Amino acid sequence: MADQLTEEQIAEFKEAFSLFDKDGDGTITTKELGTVMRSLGPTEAELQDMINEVNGTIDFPEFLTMMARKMKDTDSEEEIREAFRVFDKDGNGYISAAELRHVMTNLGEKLTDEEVDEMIREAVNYEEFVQMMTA
């Protein structure tokens, strides 16, 4: 989906897409697409994938849906890191099993006690626990 990004990121991408080429129809070529991607924030495989997903013209929604992937990935990684860095006053990166089980049972969403016990048995480090839960 396109709702994983932030409004400021969309505004910056729109400003770059408008200022990169002439006014009005701001369509760009493949080389222009790569240049705009390098200016906004570079591998040849990503450029080839963006060209294949898009003759040789790239409009606004194509560039948006090509850029959204890595942006949302980095945003999710940063959010997970910031969430794992909080709460724990020690900050060492590990927590007790009892505290983790209590946080998973009495907080989060709607998880039964049996499901929480199964998740605890299937699994400490917060990042490793999140990676094991995501699978």
Numbering used by the authors: 1 to 41, 44 to 56, 61 to 129, 137 to 148
Direct quotes from the study:
Ryanodine receptors (RyR) are >2-MDa membrane proteins that allow for the release of Ca2+ from the ER and SR, thus mediating a range of Ca2+-dependent processes. Each forms homotetrameric assemblies of ~5000 residue long subunits.
Similarly, two classes and corresponding structures were obtained for R615C pRyR1 in the presence of apoCaM, with 69% open, and 19% closed channels. The N-lobe can interact with the Bsol region in two different modes, with the open state complex involving a bending of the Bsol region, induced by movement of interface 2, just like in the WT pRyR1:apoCaM complexes. Relative to the Nsol, the movements in the Bsol are dampened to 1 Å around residue 2443. Despite this, the position of the inner helix S6 and the width of the pore are very similar for R615C pRyR1 and open R615C pRyR1:apoCaM. Thus, upon binding, apoCaM pushes the R615C pRyR1 into the same two conformations observed for WT pRyR1, with one corresponding to an open, and the other to a closed channel.
